[PDB]
Design a protein around this ligand. Sequence first.
Ligand code: NA
Lengths: 274, 278, 274
Amino acid sequence: YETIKARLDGTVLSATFNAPPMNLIGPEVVRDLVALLEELAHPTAPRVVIFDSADADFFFPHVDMTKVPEYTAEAAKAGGPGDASLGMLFRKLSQLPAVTIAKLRGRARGAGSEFLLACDMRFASRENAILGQPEVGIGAPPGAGAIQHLTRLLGRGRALEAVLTSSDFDADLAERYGWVNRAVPDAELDEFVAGIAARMSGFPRDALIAAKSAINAISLPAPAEVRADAALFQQLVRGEKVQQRTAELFKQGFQTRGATELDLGDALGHLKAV
Amino acid sequence: SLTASYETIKARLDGTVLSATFNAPPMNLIGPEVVRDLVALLEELAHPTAPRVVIFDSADADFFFPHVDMTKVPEYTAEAAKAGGPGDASLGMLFRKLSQLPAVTIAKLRGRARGAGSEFLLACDMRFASRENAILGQPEVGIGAPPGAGAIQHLTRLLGRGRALEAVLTSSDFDADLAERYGWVNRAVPDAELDEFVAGIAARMSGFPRDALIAAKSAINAISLPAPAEVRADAALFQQLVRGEKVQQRTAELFKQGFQTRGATELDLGDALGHLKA
Amino acid sequence: TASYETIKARLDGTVLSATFNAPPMNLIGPEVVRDLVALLEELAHPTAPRVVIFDSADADFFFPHVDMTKVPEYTAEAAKAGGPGDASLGMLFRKLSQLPAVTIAKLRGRARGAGSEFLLACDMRFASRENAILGQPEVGIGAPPGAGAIQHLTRLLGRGRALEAVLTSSDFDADLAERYGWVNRAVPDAELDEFVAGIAARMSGFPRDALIAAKSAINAISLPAPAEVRADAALFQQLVRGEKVQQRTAELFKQGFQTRGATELDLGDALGHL
Ligand code: NA
């Protein structure tokens, strides 16, 4: 794919997001993810997919704020009527027959964090993984699953903290809060994740699918709630207050590889109230 | 900076951040005055131009709230009723209104918060506790009733079944570090850093769009709060057991040893309960 | 107090210490299930002990898993505890969870499969840092866990960590089990007996109706519905009928399953070699 480099080692696929300049989630990333999910639904597809990033500093910084309609239209192609949202695409990711493992170095914010949250397991580099939900600070509630996943993983208090402060969390704090399964030393992370994927590679396909389906049924929101979250994000992200705050962010180097994106959580605290 | 302040709650507004300090001597028992003032504060905070964020703390040297005043239950329940509709005459329903406020609420804990005191903190949006001096507990079962103002609903969700059964059924006191490990508080913070930490959190949210804060909070609450019927059921059961013979006898024994005074029984109530003889 | 063939019981005031002792290796077989059914009946009485501490007499195991050579027999025993469609360890363990008596599982050594599910059905779990091991080997063999691990682990661990524990079928030490939420706390082995005795003692003088009321209210929020317990069992049964489970179970027996060898001592690892 244009934005996803795939290497298949047995029944384990390594899918690497490589969408220069900085791995924004735009229409091409979404299009290629839609195509990948279609492939991974095949009976003889890999049992396990490991997701990682080719970018030095980011997994995904967030969605491309200049292409919201465009990436939304790509996301719609994965679903049926009512599913024109990144949120419903990430729901399909969560329900995939393949076991998905997110391996995080560097920064994953906004829908970047939501992508990780939709995967089955998250393992993060202690030294360099950073998670955040900048959406509220910019001016919209998270629209692709953070509300649904974080509330269940973190519990009410910690989810309110993460979502409403829009602050950045290092890997150790993310582990303590439950946002990732575990923080692992950077030097051990690749081997640790490869080993886990190798565990499951030899297990009966139907057992993996049955157990995952059963756990998902208990722990995923209903589609109505996913669609409601997306609709409210889609409304507020087009609103005047978000326009003004995003305009200030653009002046300060938003969607460039600089201080604003590297330390976006901090940057939001300096924005003038609208 | 116009904002109401009350006999038992010292409230002041600095921009869009309200600081509200509970100060109800002699020892911050949740009595009718505290409940009345909290009812009034929650009504004020429903206004669209009200503060984005409220920081709650305590003026008391040793307690946030020790628990409810067990000598004034009908009187404080009557005050609590004024916050809601028919069937909402309970601290549980008052604390549900607190949870659902448009304002983001931060509980800053030093010293002891037990019973309905812990339940107040649990109803707030975020809890940050002094590592050195914060203590949490649910003494209700040890006295002889299940918690009646939300601890069952909140702790089961935050702690999970096993740890909630441990906390509620043992009525033991938890220090800040263990409270954090169990999920009763968001984080334990060194005492010397706690004020600045909480101020920073509040300052973050102070400049964020009001509608985004409210939208996100409301959606999170929808997933994680009980239904009103469950809150009312929790309250009903507590109000009846606090009048059964065992609670009356054990409460009387506790009063004999200094319950509702600033002494060993209240400073270490978790321990006191374990030594009461059946 | 009553002692049983496989459950050695001592009553001290209002605290019952019930020790599982079913040689050669504490498999959950028909005798264990029979005796557990009888014990649950006794513990329903108004003047039963307020608290029960469960432990094991076996040097290496709490319960390794069920005796897979006696499935009809132990199932028939479990059936006696419930109504139509309750002939499952899942429903038996639900009855355990709903007991008026407070149950504390004190874990040394290995508890896997339905052994872990027994512990999960108890009210509190405290584990020896040095020697407690937990695992759900079911997916590795080829079915989702059928006796409550799906329902309990998803709630206690959250989606990500539950998917990890269930899909990997890996063994978890006490410290990791505590971090993930599978046990309440990990305690040094030398302190574990005193710690658990202290917890039981806290509750010994508490009003019976308060303990029962609070436990019932917590269970109502945190237990699955009976239909979901029945469905967990049925899903396990569908997959267990399949060729892969039959084949992999046979290979495990060929490698010393249900004997005190490497396969049972280190079952998590053993599944990876199939
Ligand atoms: Na948790």
